[PDB]
Design an enzyme around this catalytic site. Structure first.
Site, short mmCIF file in Angstrom:
data_model
loop_
_atom_site.label_atom_id
_atom_site.label_comp_id
_atom_site.label_asym_id
_atom_site.label_seq_id
_atom_site.Cartn_x
_atom_site.Cartn_y
_atom_site.Cartn_z
N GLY A 1 0.77 -1.23 0.00
CA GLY A 1 0.00 0.00 0.00
C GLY A 1 0.80 1.28 0.00
N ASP B 1 5.05 -3.07 3.13
CA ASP B 1 5.68 -2.66 1.87
C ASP B 1 7.19 -2.74 2.07
OD1 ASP B 1 6.24 -1.39 -0.70
OD2 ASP B 1 4.16 -0.66 -0.61
N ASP C 1 9.12 -7.86 1.47
CA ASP C 1 9.28 -8.04 0.03
C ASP C 1 8.29 -9.14 -0.32
OD1 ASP C 1 10.08 -9.02 -2.56
OD2 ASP C 1 11.99 -7.98 -2.30
N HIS D 1 -1.64 -6.02 -11.80
CA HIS D 1 -1.51 -5.59 -13.19
C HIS D 1 -0.12 -5.04 -13.53
CE1 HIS D 1 -2.50 -0.99 -12.80
NE2 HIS D 1 -1.74 -1.41 -11.81
#
Ligand SMILES: NCCC[C@H](N)C(=O)O
Ligand code: NA
Ligand code: NA
Lengths: 458, 450
Positions: free
Chosen positions: A271, A293, A324, A344
């Site tokens: 995020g 993150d 990670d 994506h």
């Protein structure tokens, strides 16, 4: 009149049904403005409409999807094909003009003089020949951006106000119309048939990187932004404004966060600063959020949370854990694992790896929410046999919502030319998750992207 | 109750009535509504669109666009505008890849893997490109990952009169023309003038080591001059400019009246005038080589006009010499928008010096009119008026006037002119304005000796 009924046909029935979609959708959009006790917006007013900086309602966005799809289909059906295709071929021009007027600072200059400026003053201030600048401005004005108040005297309107440097959308408009995106589309075919840039979806082989190499630049998108002064922060603000301009905060209104038990945990995997988790925690104080993150991003996120929502840190409702997510699983036994606009950006193998990492950390109470466009196939069979939890375009819209869902497909092509990645269909997501032992539940439609829900299969 | 609600409902009425009249235009030719999934051309696809159809399409497209933009949040609309480069990029890519002719050879449709093998493009990338086009009603997906032509992708076949202009307008050279427009406009050498070698396209081409005009550049590229000529002819055909025949009252001229097609090339326009209206005589004037080519063209396409002594050919340099005198009509089309004011006034004075008191000058070009309410409210009565509440004018319904102007800037460093600009030039050449003849695309403005 009687032209839809005099000599009847299926095509005339479809035209009349498009007209019915347009009329009913326009009336529903009016109702949305009435719900907010607002008048209908004006394209000549020089100040924002009260709803210009508000989250669009889900109903308004669904309405607009139908209205835009139906108008586009009606016009493309009735016009000669060469007429429509010629206009398509000239659609590069308006974004070129937008980029030019952003670079020239026309909208802030006009905001300093709200009643308007004569074109000779605009020419003196921008350094552009007055008739060339008027050509640019009139193409934009014809498309309801800026306005001509008297002959050769120009002013802002509600669409050119989105170009002011303070707004939350100017940075994404600047990026998408800007020179880097123009370079990304300059040599697409050559990159696609190039023996080195064509066959793979590798990050350093996008058409943008192809154009940068062909002009003598060594380095990927990241490196290119780092070498441009103040461009990484520009890109970050552009991403934030891309989320804002698309109304993605409608997540807060579509998924039933209020129905999660008090103390439920939302793990925002990848995020960044946590711009979504911060809004969840602000709006649903009964939930705890976990931001995960990269370590550097996690420190930036701690500073960001200290900036905007220190109460969550003081209340121990927000936690931060570096990760990670390709090499380590997220924290276990969270109620929700939320990943937005992450899938994506990566290929199938890396996605399956991440999905397995998430699955290994899940408990029977866990679920996975994937926020992304669902780039469905456009044949009648695929659309007819889609999952019933997906929104379905009404008769006679085709394919799907048509232009009403343009951003799913302009998004996908953008992902191709800028990032060398792709959006995926719902079937693709289900297959990836099934390879990671995740079972599909339903789609939570945001009238833009979709939030798909999965649960541990066994 | 409110004025905004009344305007939304007036836009709805414009949409309903314009669609009804478009349907009537299809019924007049005994045609059904065109299909966006049919694999064959509609009978009217290669026909000249009627004036009534183009008028109602101006209104329909303007009203749809204004309705959607009024009701949508401004950020939504502007975001979609910002992504409008993508469809032309996809069109150019599928043209270079030859997708439409490939699908024409196999009308049932082809699986994405066959298309990938034939085009050398990764199948999922080609699928992304095709689906963006298909969502915009160009090509279609007949089954999952099986694609086929539709009536819009048929315009991309090599034989059509539109594939060349679409190829040019979406192609690499045009993409270079919009690459660095701002930089060209603020550059102290490229910015201040309309010189042919100072266009934004030439500004971009400097980064390849080129310097010169568009003509020079085209001659450096193999087969570019011929492709450009084909593209200009096809741009004319695909815009229905031959509605000139139906708008200016040629049948109200007395038999024996003469039409001087000044700078008409092969005479592609005047030969159609001569065929539709045998009571007219045509005088074609252009450069000597062009005049010999035009003689060949008329012998091949309308020899009766040569046998009946109805067409004459006289070479001219219309900047250096006056056209033939005492003609009833002098006609210039898409000439003025290529030259600066001084050269235009020179040409117009040359024309004026040849005219008799009964002569008229017809100028066919876009009228890039101002978009303020005062200019529109007080425009000449011969101009079409957009119905309430369309603003400005027909809005997106008249886009090609204003995409034309911008195109002329970035590719040619020239400009379209407003009606007032035209009137001022002609007044400088002792020509008085009469009226506009609306072609629902370009306009034909009429002038007489003052
Ligand atoms: N006096 C103002 C002239 C503007 C005019 N509608 C034109 O565009 O020609
Ligand atoms: Na630039
Ligand atoms: Na139809």
């Amino acid at each position: 009149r009687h032209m839809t009924t005099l000599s009847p046909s299926e095509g005339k029935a479809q035209i009349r049904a498009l007209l019915n979609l347009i009329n009913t959708s326009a009336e529903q959009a009016i109702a949305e403005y009435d719900k907010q006790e607002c008048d209908i917006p004006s394209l000549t007013s020089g100040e924002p409409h009260p709803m210009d900086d508000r989250l669009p309602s889900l109903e308004l966005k669904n309405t607009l999807r139908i209205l835009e799809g139906a108008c586009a289909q009606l016009c493309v059906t009735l016009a000669p094909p060469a007429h429509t295709m010629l206009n398509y071929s000239m659609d590069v021009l308006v974004p070129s003009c937008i980029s030019t007027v952003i670079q020239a600072g026309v909208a802030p200059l006009l905001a300093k003089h709200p009643k308007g400026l004569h074109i000779d003053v605009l020419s003196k201030e921008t350094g552009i020949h007055p008739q060339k600048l008027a050509t640019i401005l009139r193409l934009l004005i014809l498309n309801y951006c800026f306005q001509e108040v008297e002959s050769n005297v120009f002013a802002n309107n509600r669409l050119s106000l989105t170009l002011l440097p303070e707004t939350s959308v100017v940075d994404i408009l600047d990026l998408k119309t800007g020179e880097m995106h123009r370079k990304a589309t300059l040599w697409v075919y050559d990159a696609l048939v190039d023996p080195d840039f064509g066959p793979t979806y590798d990050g350093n082989k996008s058409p943008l990187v192809y154009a940068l190499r062909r002009e003598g630049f060594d380095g990927s998108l990241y490196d290119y932004l780092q070498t441009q002064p103040g461009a990484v922060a520009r890109f970050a603000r552009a991403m934030l404004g891309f989320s804002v301009s698309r109304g993605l905060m409608n997540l807060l209104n579509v998924f039933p966060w209020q129905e999660l038990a008090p103390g439920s945990t939302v793990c925002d995997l990848g995020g960044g600063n946590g711009n979504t988790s911060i809004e969840i925690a602000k709006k649903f104080p009964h939930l705890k959020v976990h931001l995960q993150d990269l370590p550097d991003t996690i420190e930036e996120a701690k500073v960001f949370w200290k900036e905007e929502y220190p109460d969550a840190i003081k209340d121990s409702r927000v936690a931060f854990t570096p990760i990670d997510f390709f090499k380590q699983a997220p924290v276990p036994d969270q109620d929700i694992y939320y990943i937005s606009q992450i899938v994506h950006n990566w290929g199938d193998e890396d996605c399956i790896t991440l999905l397995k990492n998430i699955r290994s950390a899940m408990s029977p109470k866990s679920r996975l929410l994937i926020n992304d466009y669902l780039a469905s196939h456009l044949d009648k069979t695929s659309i007819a046999n889609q999952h019933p939890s997906l929104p379905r375009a009404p008769y006679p819209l085709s394919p799907g919502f048509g232009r009403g869902m343009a951003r799913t497909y302009t998004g996908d092509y953008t992902m191709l030319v800028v990032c060398n990645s792709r959006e995926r269909s719902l079937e693709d997501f289900i297959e990836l998750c099934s390879a990671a032992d995740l079972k599909f539940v339903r789609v939570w439609d945001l009238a833009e992207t979709s939030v798909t829900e999965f649960v541990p299969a066994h």
